[PDB]
Scaffold this active site. Structure first.
Site, PDB file in Angstrom:
ATOM      1  N   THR A   1       0.821  -1.208   0.000  1.00  0.00           N
ATOM      2  CA  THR A   1       0.000   0.000   0.000  1.00  0.00           C
ATOM      3  C   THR A   1       0.861   1.267   0.000  1.00  0.00           C
ATOM      4  OG1 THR A   1      -1.759   1.171   1.155  1.00  0.00           O
ATOM      5  CG2 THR A   1      -0.250  -0.013   2.488  1.00  0.00           C
TER       6      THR A   1
ATOM      7  N   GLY B   1       5.176   2.599   0.133  1.00  0.00           N
ATOM      8  CA  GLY B   1       6.620   2.384   0.087  1.00  0.00           C
ATOM      9  C   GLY B   1       7.073   0.969  -0.256  1.00  0.00           C
TER      10      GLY B   1
ATOM     11  N   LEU C   1       7.895 -13.784   5.643  1.00  0.00           N
ATOM     12  CA  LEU C   1       7.170 -14.892   5.056  1.00  0.00           C
ATOM     13  C   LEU C   1       7.577 -15.002   3.591  1.00  0.00           C
ATOM     14  CD1 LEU C   1       5.343 -13.961   7.574  1.00  0.00           C
ATOM     15  CD2 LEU C   1       3.633 -15.417   6.518  1.00  0.00           C
TER      16      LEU C   1
ATOM     17  N   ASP D   1      -8.596  -4.580   2.924  1.00  0.00           N
ATOM     18  CA  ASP D   1      -7.862  -4.907   1.696  1.00  0.00           C
ATOM     19  C   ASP D   1      -7.423  -6.372   1.710  1.00  0.00           C
ATOM     20  OD1 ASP D   1      -7.072  -4.284  -0.827  1.00  0.00           O
ATOM     21  OD2 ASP D   1      -5.086  -3.526  -0.276  1.00  0.00           O
TER      22      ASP D   1
ATOM     23  N   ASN E   1      -1.801  -9.475  -0.402  1.00  0.00           N
ATOM     24  CA  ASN E   1      -1.641  -9.138   1.012  1.00  0.00           C
ATOM     25  C   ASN E   1      -1.854 -10.348   1.896  1.00  0.00           C
ATOM     26  OD1 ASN E   1      -1.179  -6.408   0.329  1.00  0.00           O
ATOM     27  ND2 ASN E   1      -3.350  -5.868   0.649  1.00  0.00           N
TER      28      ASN E   1
END
Ligand SMILES: CCS(=O)(=O)c1ccc(Nc2ncc3cc(Cl)c(=O)n(C4CCCC4)c3n2)c(C)c1
EC number: 2.7.11.22
Lengths: 296, 278
Positions: free
Chosen positions: A14, A16, A83, A127, A132
């Protein structure tokens, strides 16, 4: 930041750049969200202030862990646990054979454990989309990128009007509802569930309206009886194409009856009828609690 | 112990939700004596700063929640510092409001408005410096349950209907703004930080209703709020004498939502009347 060695860029979420990186002292592998601040007219952007403050409150095995927040000249680093990849690259790497269905119990169950924790803490994610959704090599899967999350009040008020990536956005949002709360996250998970089975987005809309109509085609256009109020919602148009609820074996064949039950309770048109994360956890469908190691 | 006022919740478990809220009241600390770390400062200076933030909130149609977030960020930040001079207070307050507005509002005013309202005392870059100083000193703990959010919870419980849907707003506006007006007066007095935020909200509610209602909606017993209630008596007196303000309307805000917008009261004289009575 002298204690961190950047390995490679991992991608932009979302806000950087994210990096794989190693803790020089302990050798621990971490993700490093970078925020450049001299790029930013408003200082620390609201998405970062929300993510940091929400994730300092939220410690759960199914939520990516914020380990640290480091401020160096013009830059803000968020140190997260590592992860291995998002579910969108995992799905499409396994897009020929499909994804074995014991892992789809595992991943939808864990994802609901996370979300139920968020909602008990009064956090909307807003989101939940496979990019994500991190799933690691032990197999666990974790909610991540809370840059679009918001804490909701009791009661709620009107929040940001267009939220969730379009393929996962709930119908109440598309129609401009005054209020939304936890249902919008549950909707998203349904879109992901069927996207795991069909190994293809349940509603891959190319537009706002195209996303709406993908939903109507598959569930049937709603009416004042299935969703009392639809006709008085701001973005409701009488002109919509009356479609038929295609049986829950066509729109998504691999499913058994319970897979069809759960998914339809998660895609209920009325937010107020739609199932909670808690209830979805109690659905029969999660009686066998499988936890397989994936292929990567 | 404390009653559990929440109904059965369809979206999560009421017991977990409530225990999380009560732990929020524990891990966020406030210190009624923090100005002792700042010997050049007086409590009236805090009251003047906070009252001015209320004025800024009204000009920009900011939410009550935004004001109380800023109030909490200011009070807790100041408890982490020493020897601040009065010429810095404006910047600390306006940067606290900037953080709070970015957290809470959908489309907050831009940096340049937060600088503008300070009438030359604070530049944009100064506000960007101070916001980082604040957030780091607070360790990014920026999700308190504010005073007014406790009032929101209480009002929702009070007017719960058949639906047992605590998330859709169901309370009438006038009672909310009247209690809120008393809380806005009390918060100007640093001694309020002696009481937990949920007890301040319960005590203001009580002065506008009854023990039955207070206990119904907060779960407190009378002994939990008694000292706060007693402390609040003169502020409630001053508000009752003066009379409650009417509901204002706001350009671009639906009238049914207008009670959520922070209003400003030239009430530093009210504050003085209230404290003179002690
Ligand atoms: C092209 C994507 S991929 O499959 O190559 C891939 C995806 C994920 C990860 N891992 C990972 N581990 C921890 C975080 C923590 C945060 Cl906060 C975070 O945002 N992200 C990413 C998710 C959205 C963009 C950054 C993380 N990613 C890797 C190694 C590859």
């Amino acid at each position: 930041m002298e204690n961190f060695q950047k390995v490679e860029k991992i991608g932009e979420g979302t806000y950087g750049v994210v990096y794989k990186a190693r803790n020089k002292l302990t050798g621990e592998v971490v993700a490093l969200k970078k925020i450049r601040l001299d790029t930013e007219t408003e200082g620390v952007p609201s998405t970062a202030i929300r993510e940091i403050s929400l994730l300092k409150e939220l410690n759960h095995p199914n939520i990516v862990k914020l380990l640290d927040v480091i401020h160096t000249e013009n830059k803000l680093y968020l140190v997260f646990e590592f992860l291995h990849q998002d579910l969108k690259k995992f799905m499409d790497a396994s897009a020929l054979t499909g994804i074995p269905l014991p892992l789809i119990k595992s991943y939808l169950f864990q994802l609901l454990q996370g979300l139920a924790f968020c909602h008990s803490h009064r956090v909307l994610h807003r989101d939940l989309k496979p990019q994500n959704l991190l799933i690691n090599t032990e197999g666990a899967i974790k909610l991540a990128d809370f840059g679009l999350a918001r804490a909701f009040g009791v009661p709620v008020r009107t929040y940001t009007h267009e939220v969730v990536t379009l393929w996962y956005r709930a119908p109440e949002i598309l129609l401009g509802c005054k209020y939304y709360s936890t249902a919008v996250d549950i909707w998203s998970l349904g879109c992901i569930f069927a996207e795991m089975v069909t190994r293809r987005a349940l509603f891959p809309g190319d537009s706002e309206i195209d996303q709406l109509f993908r939903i109507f085609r598959t569930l049937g256009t709603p009416d004042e009886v299935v969703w009392p109020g639809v006709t008085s919602m701001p973005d409701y148009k009488p002109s919509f194409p009356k479609w038929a609820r295609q049986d829950f074996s066509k729109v998504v064949p691999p499913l058994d009856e319970d897979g069809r039950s759960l998914l339809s309770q998660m895609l209920h048109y009325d937010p107020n009828k739609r199932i909670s994360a808690k209830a979805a956890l109690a659905h029969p469908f999660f009686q066998d609690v499988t936890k397989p190691v994936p292929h990567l | 112990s404390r009653g559990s006022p929440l109904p059965v919740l369809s979206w999560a478990n009421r017991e977990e939700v409530w225990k999380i809220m009560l732990n929020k009241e524990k891990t966020y600390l406030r210190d009624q004596h923090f100005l002792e770390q700042h010997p050049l400062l007086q409590p009236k200076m805090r009251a003047i700063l906070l009252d001015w933030l209320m004025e800024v909130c009204e000009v920009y149609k900011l939410h009550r929640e935004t004001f109380y977030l800023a109030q909490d960020f200011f009070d807790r930040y100041m408890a982490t510092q020493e020897n601040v001079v009065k010429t810095l207070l404006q910047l600390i307050g306006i940067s606290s409001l900037f953080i709070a507005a970015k957290l809470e509002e959908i489309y907050p005013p831009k940096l340049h408005q937060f600088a503008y309202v300070t009438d030359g005392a604070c530049s944009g870059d100064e506000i960007l410096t101070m916001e980082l100083m604040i957030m780091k000193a607070l360790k990014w703990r920026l999700s308190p349950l504010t005073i007014v959010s406790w009032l929101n919870v209480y009002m929702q419980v009070a007017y719960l209907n058949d639906l047992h849907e605590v998330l859709l707003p169901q309370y009438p506006q006038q009672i909310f703004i009247q209690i809120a007006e008393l809380l806005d007066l009390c918060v100007l007095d640093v001694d309020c930080l002696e009481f937990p935020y949920g007890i301040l909200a319960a005590s203001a509610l009580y002065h506008f209703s009854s023990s039955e209602l207070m206990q119904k909606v907060s779960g407190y017993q009378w002994c939990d709020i008694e000292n706060c209630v007693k402390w609040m008596v003169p502020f409630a007196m001053v508000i009752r004498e003066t009379g409650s303000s009417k509901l204002k309307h706001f350009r671009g805000v639906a009238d049914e939502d207008a009670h959520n917008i922070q209003t400003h009261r030239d009430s530093l004289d009210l504050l003085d009347k209230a404290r003179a009575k002690k």
